[PDB]
Amino acid sequence: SQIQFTRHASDVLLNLNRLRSRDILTDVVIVVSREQFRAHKTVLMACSGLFYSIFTDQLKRNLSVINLDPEINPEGFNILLDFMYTSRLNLREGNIMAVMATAMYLQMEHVVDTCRKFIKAS
Amino acid sequence: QIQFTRHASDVLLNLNRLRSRDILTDVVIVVSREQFRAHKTVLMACSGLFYSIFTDQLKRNLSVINLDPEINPEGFNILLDFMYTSRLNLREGNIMAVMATAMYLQMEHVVDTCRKFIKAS
Numbered sequence: 001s002q003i004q005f006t007r008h009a010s011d012v013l014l015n016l017n018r019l020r021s022r023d024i025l026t027d028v029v030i031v032v033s034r035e036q037f038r039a040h041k042t043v044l045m046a047c048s049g050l051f052y053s054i055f056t057d058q059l060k061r062n063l064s065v066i067n068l069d070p071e072i073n074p075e076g077f078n079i080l081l082d083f084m085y086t087s088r089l090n091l092r093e094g095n096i097m098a099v100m101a102t103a104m105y106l107q108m109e110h111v112v113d114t115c116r117k118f119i120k121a122s
Numbered sequence: 123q124i125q126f127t128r129h130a131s132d133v134l135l136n137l138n139r140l141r142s143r144d145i146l147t148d149v150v151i152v153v154s155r156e157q158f159r160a161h162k163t164v165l166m167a168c169s170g171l172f173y174s175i176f177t178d179q180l181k182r183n184l185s186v187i188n189l190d191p192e193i194n195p196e197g198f199n200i201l202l203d204f205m206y207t208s209r210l211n212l213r214e215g216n217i218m219a220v221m222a223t224a225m226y227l228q229m230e231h232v233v234d235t236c237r238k239f240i241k242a243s
């Protein structure tokens with residue numbers, strides 16, 4: 001029965017994306033083949049089953065660099081990283097398969113479901 | 123792009139889980155004798171005071187912040203919970219402390235809602 005601020009979560013996420021864009025308090029670089037992406041571990045863990053598992057693993061929790069499977073499409077990864085920080089998923093016919101396979105790997109179940117629905121819709 | 127209307131609230135819920143588990147928290151906020159662990163990114167995202175503090179290169183890496191000792195720790199507790207939940211627990215017995223703490227933390231819409239609460243009582 002508390003007072004709900006309906007825009008608060010999206011305002012927080014916008015500000016987290018602002019911090020990312022300025023490289024403020026980022027603490028990890030994700031490597032996907034030749035491409036690198038700086039991020040906040042906390043956001044990655046809050047958005048992805050794989051990243052939650054990685055950053056709670058004793059072996060990997062203190063690492064500043066995480067190498068993902070180099071078979072992952074870096075554009076597919078970047079689409080999902082942007083989604084994590086914006087709530088907007090840029091699905092197109094040209095990227096649906098790579099995004100869907102990357103979302104499986106990252107363990108982002110509602111993304112995968114939406115990719116399946118995108119296939120149904122086209 | 124396709125909008126996921128529940129995503130931001132789900133992210134915030136998971137950040138609150140991390141806070142409760144003390145996972146990747148990087149600062150303790152001291153309010154009188156009371157200690158609150160948090161993530162500086164969330165604090166910067168939710169508070170003009172913490173944004174201004176941690177944006178400074180010479181203060182970015184601080185692991186302890188001592189707030190003004192006149193701040194009511196329950197007022198801070200309410201506002202920290204709000205930062206991580208979007209829910210504000212306002213009561214007649216805490217309104218003045220929450221309002222003054224939100225002024226100090228530079229949380230403008232909380233202050234506005236406290237003014238509305240005063241207008242309604």
Ligand SMILES: C[C@H]1CN(C)CCN1c1cc(NC(=O)Cn2cc(-c3cc(C(N)=O)c(O)c(F)c3F)c3c(=O)n4c(nc32)CCC4)c(Cl)c(F)n1
Pocket residue numbers: 045046047048049050052107108109110111112126128129130132133136137139140143
């Ligand atoms: C390990 C659990 C369970 N334990 C028993 C207790 C503690 N747990 C826990 C977990 C977490 N992190 C997560 O849950 C990370 N995460 C985030 C999501 C997720 C997806 C989407 C999307 N659109 O796909 C989304 O919009 C969104 F907003 C999301 F959040 C997700 C997921 O879809 N899947 C998975 N993990 C996801 C795995 C399966 C699919 C954190 Cl931070 C925390 F503190 N505790």
Ligand SMILES: C[C@H]1CN(C)CCN1c1cc(NC(=O)Cn2cc(-c3cc(C(N)=O)c(O)c(F)c3F)c3c(=O)n4c(nc32)CCC4)c(Cl)c(F)n1
Pocket residue numbers: 005007008009011012015016018019166167168169170171173228229230231232233
């Ligand atoms: C300066 C901006 C705009 N520029 C154009 C680009 C850079 N910007 C920026 C800002 C930030 N951080 C902040 O804005 C910190 N912050 C957060 C809030 C805030 C309050 C509430 C509430 N209910 O009260 C809320 O629900 C909510 F969701 C909030 F977010 C807030 C505020 O109310 N006030 C102040 N600061 C607040 C000062 C005055 C009042 C971060 Cl992290 C970042 F990376 N960039």
